[PDB]
Amino acid sequence: QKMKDKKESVYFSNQRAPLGKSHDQTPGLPKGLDILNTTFGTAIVRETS
Amino acid sequence: MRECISIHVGQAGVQIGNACWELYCLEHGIQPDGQMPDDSFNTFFSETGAGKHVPRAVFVDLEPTVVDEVRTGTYRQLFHPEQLITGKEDAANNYARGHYTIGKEIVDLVLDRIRKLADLCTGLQGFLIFHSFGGGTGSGFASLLMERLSVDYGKKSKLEFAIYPAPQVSTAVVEPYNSILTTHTTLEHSDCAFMVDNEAIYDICRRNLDIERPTYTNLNRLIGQIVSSITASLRFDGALNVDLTEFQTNLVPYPRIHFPLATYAPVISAEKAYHEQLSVAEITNACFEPANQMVKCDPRHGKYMACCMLYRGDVVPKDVNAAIATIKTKRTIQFVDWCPTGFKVGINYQPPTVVPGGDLAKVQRAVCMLSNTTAIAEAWARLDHKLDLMYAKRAFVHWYVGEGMEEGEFSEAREDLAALEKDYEEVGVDS
Amino acid sequence: MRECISIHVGQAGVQIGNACWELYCLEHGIQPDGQMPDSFNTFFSETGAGKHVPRAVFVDLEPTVVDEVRTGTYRQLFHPEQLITGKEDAANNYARGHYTIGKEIVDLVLDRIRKLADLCTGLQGFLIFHSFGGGTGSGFASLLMERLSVDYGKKSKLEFAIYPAPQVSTAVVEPYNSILTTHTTLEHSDCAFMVDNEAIYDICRRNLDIERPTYTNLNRLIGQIVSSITASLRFDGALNVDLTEFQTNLVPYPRIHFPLATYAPVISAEKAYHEQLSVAEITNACFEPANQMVKCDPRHGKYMACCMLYRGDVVPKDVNAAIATIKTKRTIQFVDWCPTGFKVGINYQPPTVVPGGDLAKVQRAVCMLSNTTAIAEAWARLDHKLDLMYAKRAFVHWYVGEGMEEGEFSEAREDLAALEKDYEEVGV
Amino acid sequence: MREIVHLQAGQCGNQIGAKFWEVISDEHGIDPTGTYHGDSDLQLERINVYYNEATGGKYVPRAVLVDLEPGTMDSVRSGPFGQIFRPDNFVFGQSGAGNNWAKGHYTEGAELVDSVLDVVRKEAESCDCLQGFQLTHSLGGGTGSGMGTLLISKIREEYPDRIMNTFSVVPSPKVSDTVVEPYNATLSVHQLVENTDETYCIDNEALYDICFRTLKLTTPTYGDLNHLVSATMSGVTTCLRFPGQLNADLRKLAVNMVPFPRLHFFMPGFAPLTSRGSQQYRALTVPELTQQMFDAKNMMAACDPRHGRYLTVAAVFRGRMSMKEVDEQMLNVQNKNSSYFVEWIPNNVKTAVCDIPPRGLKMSATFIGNSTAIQELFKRISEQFTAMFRRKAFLHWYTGEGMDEMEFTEAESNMNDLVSEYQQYQ
Amino acid sequence: MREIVHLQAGQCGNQIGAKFWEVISDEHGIDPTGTYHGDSDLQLERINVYYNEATGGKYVPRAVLVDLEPGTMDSVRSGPFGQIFRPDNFVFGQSGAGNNWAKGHYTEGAELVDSVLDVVRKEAESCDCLQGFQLTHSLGGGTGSGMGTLLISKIREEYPDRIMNTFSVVPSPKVSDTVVEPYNATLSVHQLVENTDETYCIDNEALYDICFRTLKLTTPTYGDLNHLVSATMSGVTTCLRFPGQLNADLRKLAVNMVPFPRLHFFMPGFAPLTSRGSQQYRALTVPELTQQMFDAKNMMAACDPRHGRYLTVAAVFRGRMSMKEVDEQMLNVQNKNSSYFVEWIPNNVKTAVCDIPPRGLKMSATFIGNSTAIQELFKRISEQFTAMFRRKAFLHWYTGEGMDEMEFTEAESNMNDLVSEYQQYQ
Amino acid sequence: TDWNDMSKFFQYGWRCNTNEDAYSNRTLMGNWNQERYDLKNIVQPKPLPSQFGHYFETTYDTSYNNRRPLSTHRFKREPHWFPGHQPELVPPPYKCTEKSTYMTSYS
Amino acid sequence: YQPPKSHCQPIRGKREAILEMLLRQQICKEVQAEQVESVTH
Ligand SMILES: Nc1nc2c(ncn2[C@@H]2O[C@H](COP(=O)(O)OP(=O)(O)OP(=O)(O)O)[C@@H](O)[C@H]2O)c(=O)[nH]1
Ligand SMILES: Nc1nc2c(ncn2[C@@H]2O[C@H](COP(=O)(O)OP(=O)(O)OP(=O)(O)O)[C@@H](O)[C@H]2O)c(=O)[nH]1
Ligand SMILES: Nc1nc2c(ncn2[C@@H]2O[C@H](COP(=O)(O)OP(=O)(O)O)[C@@H](O)[C@H]2O)c(=O)[nH]1
Ligand SMILES: Nc1nc2c(ncn2[C@@H]2O[C@H](COP(=O)(O)OP(=O)(O)O)[C@@H](O)[C@H]2O)c(=O)[nH]1
Ligand SMILES: [Mg+2]
Ligand SMILES: [Mg+2]
DSSP, rough: HHHHHHHTTTTSSTTOOOOOOOOOOOOOGOOOOGGGGGSSSOOOOOOOO | EEEEEEEEEEEHHHHHHHHHHHHHHTTTTOOOBBBOOOOOGGGTTTOOOOTBOOEEEEEEESSGGGHHHHHTTTTTTSSSSGGGGEEEOOOOSOHHHHHHHHHTTTTHHHHHHHHHHHHSSSEEEHHHHHHTTTHHHHHHHHHHHHHHHHHHHHHSEEEEEEEOOOOOOOOSSSSSHHHHHTTSSSSOOOOOEEEOOOOHHHHHHHHHHHHOOOOSHHHHHHHHHHHHHHHHHHHHHOSSSTTTTTSSSSSSBTBOOBBOOOOEOOOOOOHHHHOOOOOOOHHHHTSSSSSSSSSSSOEEEEEEEEEEEEEEEEEOHHHHHEEEEEEEESSSSSSOTTOSOOOOOOOOOOOOOOOOSSSSOOOHHHHHHHHEEGGGGHHHHHHHHHHHHHHHHTOOOHHTTTTTTOOHHHHHHHHHHHHHHHHTTTTTSOO | OOOOOEEEEHHHHHHHHHHHHHHHHHTOOOOOOBBOOOOOOOTTOOOOOSBBSSSEEEEETTTTTTTTTHHHHTTTTTOOTTEEOOOOOOSSOIIIIIISSSSTTTTHHHHHHHHHHHSSSSSOEEEEEEESSSIIIIIIIHHHHHHHHHTTOOOOOOOEOOOOOOOSSSSHHHHHHHHHHHHTTTSSSSSEEEOOOHHHHHHHHHHOOOSSHHHHHHHHHHHHHHHHHGGGGSSSSSSSOOOOHHHHHOOOSSTTOOOOOEHHHHHHHTTTTGSSSHHHHHHHSSSSSOSSSSSOGGGGSSSEEEEEEEESSSSSHHHHHHHHHTTTTTTOOOOOSSOEEEEEEEESOOOOOTTTTSOOSSSEEEEEEEEEEEGGHHHHHHHHHHHHHHTTTTHHHHHHHOOOOOOOHHHHHHHHHHHHHHHTTOOO | OOEEEEEEEEHHHHHHHHHHHHHHHHTBOTTTTSSSSOOOOOOTTTTTTTEEEEESOOOOOOEEEOOOTTTTTHHSTTTTTSSSTTSSSSEEOOOOOOOOOOOIIIIHHHHHHHHHHHHHHHHHTTTTEEEEEEEEOEEEEEEEEIIIIIHHHHHHHHHSEEEEEEEEEEOOSSSSSSSHHHHHHEEEEHTTTTOOOOEEOHHHHHHHHHHHSSSSSSSSHHHHHHHHHHHHTTTTTTTTSOOOOOOOOTHHHHHTSSTTTTTOEEEEOOOOOSSTTTTSSSSHHHHHHHHHHHHGGGGGSSOTHHHHHHHEEEEEEEOOOHHHHHHHHHHHHSOOOOOOOOOSSSSOOOOOEEEEEOOTSSBBOOOEEEGGGGGGHHHHHHHHHHHHHHHHTTHHHHHHTTOOOOHHHHHHHHHHHHHHHTTTOO | OEEEEEEEEEHHHHHHHHHHHHHHHTTTOOOOSSSSSOOOGGGTTTGGEEEEEOGOOOEEEEEEEEESSSSSHHHHHTTTTTTTTGGGGGOOSSSOOEEESHHIIISSSSSSSSHHHHHHHTTTSSSSEEEEEEEEEEEESIIIIIIIIHHHHHHHHHOOEEEEEEEEEEOOOOSSSSSHHHHHHHHHHHHHHHOSEEEEEEOHHHHHHHHHHHHSSOOOOOOHHHHHHHHHTTTSSSSSTOOBBOOOOEEEEEEHHHTTTTOEEEEEEEEOOOOSSSSSSSSOOOOHHHHHHSSTTSSSSSSSSSSSSSEEEEEEESSSSSSHHHHHHHHHEEEEEEETTTTSSOOOOOEEEOOOOOOOOOEEEEEEEGGGHHOOOOHHHHHHHHHHHHTTOOOOOHHTEEEEEEEEHHHHHHHHHHHHHHGGGG | SSTTTTTTSSSSSOOOSSSTTSOSSSSSSOOOHHTTSSSSTTSOOOOOOSTTTTSSSHHHHHHHHHOOOOOOOOOOOOOOSTOOOOSSSSSSOOOOOOOHHHHHHOO | OOOOOOOOSSOOOHHHEEEEEHHHHHHHHHHHOOOOSSSSO
């Protein structure tokens, strides 16, 4: 009943203010990105030693 | 084989220790039971003949119910039980309780444990202290622990990681008393004091990440991140290693002035980093943004005196130097005249490790700023103005005197710190 | 084995022995018929087929108290020749039961003791229960002990004698018999545990919640104490204590063998299970003057030797710690020539609770045998009781008219005076 | 290792203690038979503070139950939770102190104080590390106001370094049950200000107000008021018996809370109180507990904080929550109310977040306030005493007992000194 | 290879040596029936030191089980390792000595010596080259103190050229069992000096302090201390059974340990003693073993060597260790406390290294030390003897068994001469 | 610690005036850390969280503790040398006896 | 002094008691059970 109570109130301020998390970033991040194994930012190709 | 010994005092010590040691167990291949399924783990971990790794840290808190959950949790088999030191009753926001009755009861146990941890290492380079300025035992027991360690070891470096009281918000009432009484006995003993607060990390979590209403873990993870980045030059190879001894002697000009700030550059979530360019010239002026620093102060009124770059990841030097050469051109960021070009740069070849369930994004570049700044003198001015408000009406003094203290030590501490105000405003005038 | 022949003489002796043998039958698996539905050889002897008969003798000069027990629950348990009953009682007269009505029944009791002792192999001691305020248990017990010390010599005998209470009393000629039999028993008893009745009345009213008690409510306590003494002769333990260990570590001199008995956990079922009954908090209940069973106070004198007998899950570490913290109390005084002053014994068997009793089932129990100079004030009372009433020569004519000469009164009084001056040269 | 010996005196304090051991036992999962049946091992890890484990796994409590009349001590060995107490902690008297401070102090409290001090010392010396005492009583009647005050005076002598917590029941302003209440009240508060460390005042008028306009009940019973009192009194020792992210014991709530040794009269509160009809229209959130805590109608002292200024504020939050809401709510409750706090204390409030909520609630709080406005409460009793004493109205039952007229005037002077040394800090 | 005949006297001796035979068979890989269930060939190499060979390839210990009390012969066979003992080596009387040295030496301990001597003469002639004898007994009883000393005298008459060892359990200073303990203790130490070559003093209080402070056990039993004693006794005969780089038997220890024939009272100890929670975290190295082996709270006697001086010191090591760092650590522990060692000697420490550690441990070590602080053991016995003998207390039990008053005085004189002999080196 | 001869019987160990060691396990008084390290306590099973357990979970539980059912197994018995020795932990199920220096060196 | 009322409640299960007896029969029956040519040919 407590998880049911939390599920009835998902269209709430629980959207943009959870207890420990920030915001569900899956609607802002493309498809299945595997957030743990992803290195953001540009990298250098290390040609011309 | 450069090794570090950590000392975590109090509730703010033990919780930060849990976060940072989780990060250390994850940076190396260390499971929470202690098994590793390379020799870079020597700085923070020892070895045992059973293939077992034990951290080089002591947890001390007279209130037991902070170490009890550490003992009951899943990290039980990692920590040495004899390195987990608890008492029977807390210091209760009193310098005198943690400095004069059970402050001296457990000193011969903690110093024994530190000595045994020192005989098992060959090259020891310093001590990391984790305590809270406004607590009862982080202000009482740590402040005499470091004064005893200064006479027991000598030529090592004592660096403290202090939770300075936040400007507007605060927890306790007698926080100025304990803060002013623990900064009196650390000025002539400790070498340097990298210090943060809690309000600024709240603003950083609200703004730079998307997390509203965070817990203490969401701040302790950032604290563990910067503490790892400071020591990252020890256990990982790089172009320019920075040792534990060297950021003890190019940030502090005079032994009374050893209070820098703290800053982590790429504090950002997956969403905002996924659009962002993370060039060196873009994250090194995020360090100089007043919004991104873990002490609330405006450095534009203040005067920078020393800085320390700590870089990790894929970073080439001339991006760094062409970035600092841009720093010196703007009129807003202004140094002090008796200091010429005063940066210290260090490169590491290891990107930061993200923790599962964490909020930061796995990035390629990271910068840890430690900068002495004259603008930290405003915090001390507000703190001792707060005491002068409290001390006039003899508020809460009777809780201190009837606990082994003396009324004259309030005076001796306040006349000590009135000299810090006239110290900081003479190193900022035109020479 | 580790056997022991019990001798019950008098109404007090047989009424104590009823509860004692009920507790003995119920501690082992022995039914009231004497059948089991080998640690019982101390008190019971097996027959060929299936029956265990006791090793006791029940002697009385009147038949209104032994015919009670052969028409009751345990009428088949006892051997119907071990119940020796007389025709006419001594009637509160030491002279009658020592010289007139006792000179001619003691041969039968001697024969019964011999026939119990030919079945005996490893005899260790004699348990003698009687009272000091009667004619049978004062005179005939004295005659029996005098004959037994000659027929058996060095074989030990123990004494559980109901001493006359200081304030309350039953009879009138109590001090005469209680001094004569004390003078006689002095040289023929290896140990003699004094028990009062007023003190056990206070224990029942105060420790237990049962008030307006009966003689049964005291006899159960006495049976529990005597079960704790011989507990190390039947059950295994960390520290076994036998009867040769008893007097070796208690009496320092052959004339001083009068220790005080104490049972520590005495609590009813309403209050027993709300307490943390460790050996620590119940071993200092033995030193409480309210729990003492002679109506006296050990703080009036010096402790000389203490024997601590334990039951149940007693770990030697915790009794050692509690005992070594007992000596750090300035209330308790020990004599100077006994620097240690303790003897311990631990039995693994928990005490056996009797249904319908007043005590509660517990895991730990302490029996204390403290030899104290405070027993000298027990001699002063009946000493003054005699010389205040002997000077008018009251109640003498039955004594001097029934086989007793006049010099025995003066001789017994002189012996008691020598005892009183004997207990005062030890305390210095 | 920080345990508390609990003391109950008088019939009112005895019923309050009975409800207290109702609430603690159904919080720690203790059956009426004394065993354990709780649903987690976090309840049993800190059973130190209130329970002693006897042989057999039975958790008897550290309750000292004493009264001068046995007519209520048979009702105190109550139905559900009266058999958990040990029978040797009940200490009875024959003739009850029939609304007499003097009888409860001198000729019927003195012969029973020596028989209650031995069991108190027996329980106190059998502790690993004692933390303090709670004494639930009243100041109106005879046996509580006299005998508990004598107990406090005797206990403060032999343990000067412990915590002397009292949960007092001050006479109501509007409707009182007796008439000789002012006499007992002032002669009890004379020795309350000098021998204790923290005093909580609980009025029955404010409790009736709470049970009427907050829980929306028409005819509340005494057990309802006792349950509210036990609920707030259980909320101040939570952080020392349940793990959390910011802990505070009883000394924590004294060092931060009293600036002077003789200004230690608090006034409590309880945040998540809502009616049955408004149960499902109120989200349980921090800005609601914070709003209700500082409401004047939410409190169990008759004085409202609109008249005075808070010296220091305590707020023991419970439940799994975030620190930033607590911090910004405490900052905004001071910034938006700048005319109702003292200017010479920078941070008046004090926060402490435990992690275990009460039974059935998710997030809760506990208010402990030291306001200047508590001086009106003593002003009323001083007014009634000055109106009553000048005609020597009921001195016949006091002076014929072993007291003089001079003892009343010193209590009146101490009342005037408490009141006069509260207006300076306004 | 040197055979050893074991002797047990009294209840304490019988319960110590049962556990000793348990650990000896446990490190030789012998099941309780007697069969061999080991893994290596070294375990069956020198098993003749402690065992005979019976039919069917089974092994029986070379031990004699002596006590006056018939009840304790049941407690040995019914123990966890009772099947291995031969029933013909159980000798027993009717009644215990009753804590009486007099009848344990003259009355009932002098007609059963014939059977024990027949068993020993029967069994010590079944071996190839007997090295000597061992004895485990107590000084505070009547069997181990009376019959044991008479046994030592008779064997010393029969076999003068062998060695004699004794693991005595001396009376503890402050905890005690018997009121007549000094009477037996003085009169046993008087008989020990002329008849033994090696004597070890074991205090029960020292073992309890070990089990409290080092092993962190909250409720040790008597087997909990017999285990420590048995571990010590096995570590002095390690080079007799397992090979090594520097072997040393009992005679070589005696030669390099005691300088004059009366000063043979040692203080034993065991090195790798850790708590349950810190044995996965502590690496067994030689600087760890030798730091706590020379710690003054490790040894199993109630004598403090900081009060005295070390005449000679032995240290027998087991395990695969270096031969440079053991001698470095011995000079490390010999040079820095220059005041705790006698100056007129070259070398105090005796170092012997055995290759095979106990099966499961990494390395282990055993301590044997002659100290002038062993005289403090005899002052507390002599003081309690002269406090009780001057009032002629508890004397008729000893006098009535056929003893004179001058034996007590002459035994006290021997004790005082022994004390004054040790004071020359302090 | 050892202030004088009677310095003990007040510190710990030798002590008979406190409520420690009368509380059972899972109560956290006195020696409880060394009792959970005992081999008897390790083999005791751990129950699953069964109703109303969402009230009694802490931030340390939801941040660092890993909630997963644990299988319970017995240990093969091995010789103990000193009291409190627990060799039935650590990797090798059977500890072979070490070999002599000659056997290792000369081969 | 009445015939005592043995309030014998089982402290153990019926199945475990049956298993104990079943083991005990075989164990007792086995524990009671542990206890051609000349040389020149
Ligand atoms: N940033 C941060 N601050 C903390 C944390 N834990 C405690 N604090 C700070 O600690 C202050 C409270 O004082 P403490 O140091 O925890 O008290 P103590 O000295 O440990 O003494 P105790 O009351 O026994 O815990 C609060 O104002 C917090 O700002 C933490 O995990 N992160
Ligand atoms: N404690 C206790 N005392 C008893 C009991 N029965 C008798 N007495 C005591 O015995 C004393 C007198 O002894 P008697 O009952 O007359 O028995 P007796 O010694 O044989 O003397 P006579 O009956 O005259 O032959 C009385 O003072 C009682 O106190 C008993 O069952 N328990
Ligand atoms: N809240 C509450 N108040 C009570 C209770 N019982 C009595 N009182 C109050 O106590 C006052 C009487 O004083 P009381 O403490 O009972 O007298 P005493 O016990 O003899 O000292 C009355 O005004 C009641 O309002 C109760 O159960 N709850
Ligand atoms: N270490 C140890 N000491 C014991 C043991 N059993 C008894 N003792 C000690 O032995 C002493 C008494 O020995 P005792 O029974 O008189 O031996 P006896 O001569 O055969 O009677 C007591 O002080 C006990 O402390 C044991 O198993 N281990
Ligand atoms: Mg703390
Ligand atoms: Mg009769």
